[PDB]
Amino acid sequence: TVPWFPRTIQELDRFANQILSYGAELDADHPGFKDPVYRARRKQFADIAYNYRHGQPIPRVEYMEEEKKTWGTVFKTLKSLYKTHACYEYNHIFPLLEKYCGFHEDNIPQLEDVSQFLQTCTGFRLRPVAGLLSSRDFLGGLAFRVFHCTQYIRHGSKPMYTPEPDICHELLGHVPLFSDRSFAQFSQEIGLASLGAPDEYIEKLATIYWFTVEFGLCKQGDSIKAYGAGLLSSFGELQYCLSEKPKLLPLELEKTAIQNYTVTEFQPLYYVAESFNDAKEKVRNFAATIPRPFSVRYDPYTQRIEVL
Ligand SMILES: [Fe+3]
């Protein structure tokens, strides 16, 4: 058989019933495990995500001073590195995010505002996400240019550390790239490749995603820059990834897809993309090899997937 995949953008609403119900914040190892206020706060964000329905504005939340402080620390510390380490596309849009979205040390941007901004740039939109989505579900949303993103913030005890994605990672790592048409197209291609793909292929796609959207490096001029969300929101690794230490291989989906990675240490190797358009073409071809009984196409006019 073939696994269920949404056919219209509203159908993404079914994902809320298939997330991991036991958050990382319930783990004794989590920095905010013994913090009842944090736990309660996380539950509050989970409830907002859980009741969210497509088409509604994403609820605005008043962040606590403590939360603003953490955001402020992370923002200030990472910003110094962007002009020199981030890809051109990241740097070109950041000033605009600062202007229209309130990306500033004293203010955590509201997802609704950021969503509206992405929509006018590439038609990308955000949806608050409760817990951990399956790889299939997370990737599927990309087909509709929908990014599921966290609204909560990491525990304030370790501002430069997070065992999971949090709002700092989403806003400083993902968002800027989604403002670029080429990257948006590339991302969506990964999304389309997964609709109805068998589980073992979803895993290959998840691995390509990891080495591109999360930890990708790209050629720029005669230089190399970071575009991976995991690198752009990590002070340590962003500096490391462009040093002499890591091994850099050229993006080759045949191999990238089978590659193993760590999730607790810096990556021993990165794949470098020629451009986002090139990467998109590579995904397109690769998707051609996924044993799927049909072909999919997205109709931006009606926001529906067309099964051919
Ligand atoms: Fe991420």
UniProtKB/Swiss-Prot annotation:
Changing D13Y: In PAH deficiency; severe. Changing P128L: In PAH deficiency; severe. Changing A229T: In PAH deficiency; severe. Changing R297S: In PAH deficiency; severe. Changing F117L: In PAH deficiency; severe. Changing I108M: In PAH deficiency; severe. Changing P250H: In PAH deficiency; severe. Changing I305S: In PAH deficiency; severe. Changing T162N: In PAH deficiency; severe. Changing Y88C: In PAH deficiency; mild. This is Phenylalanine-4-hydroxylase. It comes from Homo sapiens.
